[PDB]
Design a binder for this molecule. Structure first.
Ligand SMILES: [Fe+3]
Ligand SMILES: [Mg+2]
Ligand SMILES: [Mg+2]
Ligand SMILES: [Mg+2]
Ligand SMILES: [Mg+2]
Ligand SMILES: [Mg+2]
Ligand SMILES: [Mg+2]
Lengths: 211, 196
């Protein structure tokens, strides 16, 4: 999904709000901040209501201006609440009644997702690969800066996981794929407009093709 | 035009979500409290520091950590949520590694601790992939011109830690002494371990 959350390479932001080793304060800066992660785990591990991938996607589905003005932990409150309503576990009415006011949620999905690709290649360390030149309106774990770009395999995972584009929509056809650490030269991604060396992206097999 | 939606205070919304689920019997007794304790007390960059200090003083463990990070971390019992498949990445005299999740906040929670606000910032997520040298410089870390910077974007299930170079002046230090100088920022890759 080509949403505003796909931030890598966006220009115009200021300084990162940190100097190295500065005191970051407590883990949680407010008494509610542990709730989104804890209730995500309740949803995933206890209820089996959704996957972690579905949580990433529901946050991607926040209305774009809403996403941009919402602090991190609050996005996950909104995302988890949205999933609970979409899965029929909760109603928006009861959330707003309990909250004592408006509780706007993420927007409905505009894609049913897609299955794990039927045709993929097992790649080896050192092989040159291209990121498939594909556009996916639903969940995908490929940042746009690498779409269509060429890099070299530095690692093939020894474990396999469900394809995010499927399991991020709660589909039954996510299968399993390993992922690959793909090393791209900075200039391959940003031309002359970068000060870096290389970028390594961890890409599902189904996002790749031989170069 | 472009205005924020009306919203109840975030605390009220977060506790509403808790109460709605809890009131339906969907949240076990002590569940969120137990996670809070895990997040605050167990998930910690002290664990990553312990791993680095061991690697620095034990060539065999260093080799294991760099070839099968998951197995190395499992020896300490530090695998966990958002830290089940671990890869450690080696800094060298010509290479500096830095970790980000450009798409959200993906972090090796059990060994680095939950990500700090700055790591989840739009500034870091947008900029470090494209201009890591300038970002690090602004953050207080000057990377010498003869050193390649490699940014690992945490886009799938691999969860990363940086194994920084061991600084001069620490020869013969104990594991406890070495752990002390390996900070959270060293494990993320934005800082180099400092010797007083
Ligand atoms: Fe993330
Ligand atoms: Mg985009
Ligand atoms: Mg606000
Ligand atoms: Mg699992
Ligand atoms: Mg620039
Ligand atoms: Mg030495
Ligand atoms: Mg001594």
């Amino acid at each position: 999904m080509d949403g505003v959350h796909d931030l890598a390479g966006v220009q115009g932001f200021g300084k990162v709000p940190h100097t190295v080793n500065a005191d970051i304060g407590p883990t949680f800066h407010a008494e509610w901040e542990h709730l989104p992660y804890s209730l995500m785990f309740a949803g995933v591990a206890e209820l089996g209501a959704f996957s972690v991938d579905e949580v990433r996607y529901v946050v991607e589905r926040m209305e774009p201006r809403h996403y941009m003005m919402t602090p991190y932990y609050e996005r996950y409150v909104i995302g988890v609440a949205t999933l609970m309503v979409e899965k029929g576990i909760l109603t928006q009415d009861e959330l707003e009644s309990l909250a004592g006011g408006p509780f706007p949620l993420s927007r409905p999905s505009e894609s049913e997702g897609r299955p794990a690709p039927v045709e993929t290649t097992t790649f080896e360390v050192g092989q040159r690969v291209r990121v498939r030149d594909e556009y996916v309106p639903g969940h995908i774990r490929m940042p746009a800066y690498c779409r269509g770009r060429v890099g070299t395999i530095s690692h093939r995972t020894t474990e396999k996981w469900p394809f995010p584009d499927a399991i991020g929509h709660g589909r039954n056809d996510a299968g399993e794929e390993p992922t690959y650490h793909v090393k791209f030269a900075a200039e391959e991604l940003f031309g002359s407009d970068t000060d870096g060396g290389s970028v390594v992206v961890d890409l599902f097999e189904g996002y790749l093709e031989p170069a | 035009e472009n205005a924020a939606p009306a919203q109840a205070p975030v605390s009220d919304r977060a506790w509403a979500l808790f109460r709605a689920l809890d009131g339906k019997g969907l949240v076990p007794d002590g569940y969120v409290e137990g996670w809070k304790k895990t997040f605050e007390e167990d998930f910690s960059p002290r664990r990553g520091a312990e791993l680095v200090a061991r690697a620095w003083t034990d060539p065999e463990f260093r080799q294991l950590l760099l070839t099968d990070g998951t197995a190395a971390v499992a020896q300490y019992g530090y695998l966990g949520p958002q830290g089940e498949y671990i890869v450690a990445v080696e800094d060298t005299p010509t290479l500096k590694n830095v970790i980000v999740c450009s798409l959200c906040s993906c972090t090796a929670w059990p060994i680095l601790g939950l990500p700090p606000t700055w790591y989840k910032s739009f500034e870091y997520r947008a900029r470090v992939v494209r201009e890591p040298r300038k970002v690090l410089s602004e953050m207080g870390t000057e990377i010498a011109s003869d050193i390649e910077i490699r940014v690992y974007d945490t886009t799938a299930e691999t969860r990363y830690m940086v194994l920084p170079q061991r600084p001069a002046g620490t020869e013969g230090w104990s594991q406890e002494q070495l752990q002390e100088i390996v900070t959270k920022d060293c494990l993320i890759g934005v800082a180099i371990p400092q010797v007083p």
